[PDB]
Design a protein around this ligand. Sequence first.
Ligand SMILES: [Ca+2]
Ligand SMILES: [Ca+2]
Length: 122
Amino acid sequence: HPEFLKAGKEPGLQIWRVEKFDLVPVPTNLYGDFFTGDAYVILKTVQLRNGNLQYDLHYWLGNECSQDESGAAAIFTVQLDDYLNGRAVQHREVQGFESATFLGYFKSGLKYKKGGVASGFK
Ligand SMILES: [Ca+2]
Ligand SMILES: [Ca+2]
């Protein structure tokens, strides 16, 4: 797991996955890929015209995702928003019910994969 120190410094996208009650950053090569069995936090840092940073926080919930994965993502989201002074706008993304905002981040492939890390409860 990574802290919030490496978060919203630079424009771009950061994606962690919930993995046994724990944020694990996603490899860049797998950005745009989501397991239907897992839950995710996504941070959109966009640079404004006046040079200031805008933040859009999305937790994303796989359709086959456990209640701990689900619950952890929503928690981290708040905790990280609080960290960024509550400057982020929070969105709940449910697989197959995502905002046009969230889908706009993924012009090429938004590719759903089957499976995912198992719940914390073994
Ligand atoms: Ca899972
Ligand atoms: Ca906020």
